[PDB]
Design a protein around this ligand. Structure first.
Ligand SMILES: NC(=O)c1ccc[n+]([C@@H]2O[C@H](COP(=O)([O-])OP(=O)(O)OC[C@H]3O[C@@H](n4cnc5c(N)ncnc54)[C@H](OP(=O)(O)O)[C@@H]3O)[C@@H](O)[C@H]2O)c1
Ligand SMILES: NC(=O)c1ccc[n+]([C@@H]2O[C@H](COP(=O)([O-])OP(=O)(O)OC[C@H]3O[C@@H](n4cnc5c(N)ncnc54)[C@H](OP(=O)(O)O)[C@@H]3O)[C@@H](O)[C@H]2O)c1
Ligand SMILES: [Mg+2]
Ligand SMILES: [Mg+2]
Lengths: 439, 439
């Protein structure tokens, strides 16, 4: 860790402080440019925005501006390091929002810990941005903050932990159901740690067509029992099941078709993977340590699908796969909210990007792409330059079918051409060389 | 005004909508680069910042980040347009910070117009920034907001509509008595329209040795003197003169020596300036129309020292003339607040430049610079490319003297060389050519 520690600190300590900077997009080097960008000329756009508040997107950078707002209570895996301690991390995601999406990001870091104070602070900042990206707020404050902001602010509010990797998890589950012949209705699914990502994973599966009479949730206290605690809250113990014993998760896994373990490592053992249905779809989604190492489950059950947050083994589920392109589509369509139908469209696009892959000027040498749709390849790789081309025009299209768009765009072919032009100027061809060299 | 209004509506939005973008300053090519910016690497600066918050200025952009926070209730001269309608102006100011001082700006705008909830929003936003630049908050709540914030946050909070003219004008006065061989001990004062940019001015002048009994404040309703109204209005009783029956601005002159005025249309006539004592010191600071129309008054009395705010005539007072550069001081010294010993150290630094100008690679032709200290050269031109070299180290030294800094600067020669090198790579040589060819 010492080598990584020294490598990361030197990354942006010495050359310039920080990994982010603000530069004009206007050519101003003479007079009559400073006389209309400020003082007697900049008052003309304000008059137009004064009478037509929807004209702001044309004259200002609101339509390309999202905010990574955080109180710094649960940052990455660090925990409650505190406000400004997560200041680099926010900037880091801002960088991604540019490179992969061309979205300018402010990295606001609210100091308040009270949920209501945070809600008020972020809601007051509505005119500045065109979308909120609440990040690293510890549960259960995250749920309250996101729901209140979505119901109050008339701007896209999209939490990353909540329904971020949830999108990719839903896409992976759908593609797994497509791989092994198992209709989603007949799938009996198990949850571990119903919170943060998992709580939205289950909701997205339900929306896509998973029925709650086949779902079960088990946590450190055990299964969600109808009588485990009088505080029968819907935040965690929703759609609960009667006690009927089932103290441990061993019998829960007995007759299970998915694992979807997002929270809580090492909760899955070899015998338990053995006690599964015809084809399990273990989703070990714990970044620190996966719930079960993929090779062990592969040895125990040759015919299975395993997804892991780490990139060591295939079917890697990364947050970067989803949010920048979701926000790209929502902003470009001029949407006012990221509802469930946009998320469903994104899930469909990610699923269809996995079994409709050809050409894309495959590197004749190097690379070793060698990916074909199967148990190994369920979801597109984190950096496919064909995601933004697929996620963004679908999410935008969802706005067209939902009446939440304020700037409808015609000729989606032109939008496709613009996105392909954007991805033509951002290509990471050195990581295929590294991957090929390592083998 | 379609030659001006329309030409400003489409400033540069045709190629890219809106000024200002947040662009990465990192090597943005390889996957390893997007591993010390997020996930396994970005967690390394976080520990150091958590252990010692002062490390952030090394790892984050806080040492070069200010925030132009505003609720948009008095924008330029438009008025109470709103937080959103004032968005371009902020961006305008932002580019100035990146053009003349290289300061990154987040153009945050608060939707809440209440004069007490604004403070909480900004105080919560404190960790994001290294300085605050409140602008377009209308009077009298601007003073309240600034005073409340300066006691709460531990970073420089610096208003725009009060200190914007309180410094340069003071320098003008500090320079005016130089050419009229007077002393601040006995000079009499007149103030018109004690508003945002007026009532805060004389305080700084008091720090230079202008006794309060020589100041007479005036307003639209005649004269602000103790006794005119049964209730003495707040923040104006300090300089309110005793009751003497002086109910009009036409009589309170009594051969005064200064006419600092921050109001709307003209208040003085030819005989009004005539009533002044020898060597008047008019400071008509109204932006739309001059309060005196200098040349006419210059015809009434010779040896006049009229100072205005419009660039058409000499002795022009501009906010950009001082405001980035003083910030460039504090941010480069780690100041926790802006005292009156740095707000006044940036007064003796811009007043010195008027009679300390020579060489500086004078344009052998063109330009028609022709500046010599005297009745028509009181303050440096709004863009002497040399203000940032004279103001910023002066403010930094005043910070280190007052015990308000956190990262004291070493031997100043390196600092002056750095500021000069920044000056060299930012030149506006086309402006003198325009000013010479037009005449
Ligand atoms: N795309 C990604 O790579 C990605 C995205 C999101 C999350 N994750 C990972 O998912 C995990 C959870 O996310 P989080 O940061 O939101 O953590 P968290 O809030 O602590 O986890 C959610 C819940 O899981 C439970 N839990 C914790 N440890 C457990 C254990 N050993 N066994 C069973 N339940 C346990 C806790 O409730 P009880 O203590 O009552 O059980 C907690 O309320 C982290 O490891 C995170 O890195 C990865
Ligand atoms: N750097 C610059 O050159 C610069 C910067 C900012 C502002 N300004 C100028 O300063 C003025 C306002 O700026 P601000 O926002 O700082 O102050 P403000 O809050 O607008 O207050 C201006 C004051 O002027 C008074 N006033 C208005 N009309 C008047 C009239 N006809 N006769 C006498 N007094 C009158 C008002 O007094 P009552 O409250 O009694 O009406 C008010 O208190 C404008 O003229 C503006 O162009 C110049
Ligand atoms: Mg985070
Ligand atoms: Mg202003």
């Amino acid at each position: 860790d010492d080598q990584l520690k020294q490598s990361a600190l030197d990354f942006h300590e010495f050359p310039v402080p920080g990994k982010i900077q603000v530069s004009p997009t206007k050519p101003l080097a003479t007079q009559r440019d400073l006389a209309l960008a400020y003082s007697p000329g900049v008052a003309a756009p304000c008059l137009e925005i004064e009478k037509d508040p929807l004209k702001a997107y044309k004259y200002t950078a609101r339509g390309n501006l999202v905010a990574v707002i955080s109180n710094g209570t649960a940052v990455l895996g660090l925990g409650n390091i505190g406000a400004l301690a997560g200041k680099p991390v926010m900037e880091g995601k801002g960088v991604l929002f540019k490179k992969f999406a061309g979205i300018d990001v402010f990295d606001i870091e609210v100091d308040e810990l009270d949920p209501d104070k945070f809600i008020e602070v972020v809601a007051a900042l509505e005119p500045t941005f065109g979308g909120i990206n609440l990040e690293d707020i510890k549960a259960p404050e995250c749920f309250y903050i996101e729901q209140k902001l979505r119901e109050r602010m008339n701007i896209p509010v999209f939490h990353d932990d909540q329904h971020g990797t949830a999108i990719i998890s839903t896409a992976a589950i759908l593609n797994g159901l497509r791989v092994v012949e198992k209709n989603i209705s007949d799938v009996r699914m198990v949850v571990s740690g119903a919170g943060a990502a998992a709580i939205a994973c289950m909701n997205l599966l339900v929306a896509l067509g998973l029925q709650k009479h086949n779902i079960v949730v088990c946590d450190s206290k055990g299964v969600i029992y109808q009588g485990r605690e009088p505080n029968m809250a819907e935040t965690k113990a929703a759609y609960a099941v009667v006690d009927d014993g089932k103290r441990t998760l061993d019998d829960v896994i007995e007759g299970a078709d998915i694992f979807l373990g997002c929270s809580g490592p090492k909760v899955l053992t070899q015998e338990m993977v053995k006690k599964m249905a015809r084809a399990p779809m273990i989703l070990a989604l714990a970044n620190p340590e996966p719930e079960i190492l993929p090779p062990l489950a592969k040895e125990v059950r040759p015919d299975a699908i395993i997804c892991t947050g780490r990139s060591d083994y295939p079917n890697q589920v990364n947050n970067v796969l989803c949010f920048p392109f979701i926000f790209r589509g929502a902003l470009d369509v001029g949407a006012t909210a990221i509802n469930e139908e946009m998320k469903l469209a994104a899930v469909r696009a990610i699923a269809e990007l996995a079994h409709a892959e050809q050409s894309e000027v495959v590197a004749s040498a190097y690379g070793d792409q060698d990916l074909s749709f199967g148990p190994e390849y369920i979801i597109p790789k984190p950096f496919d330059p064909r995601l933004i081309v697929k996620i963004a025009p679908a999410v935008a299209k969802a706005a067209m079918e939902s009446g939440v768009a304020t700037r409808p765009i015609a000729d989606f072919d032109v939008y496709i051409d613009k996105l392909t032009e954007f991805v033509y100027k951002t290509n990471l061809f050195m990581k295929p060389i590294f991957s090929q060299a390592r083998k």
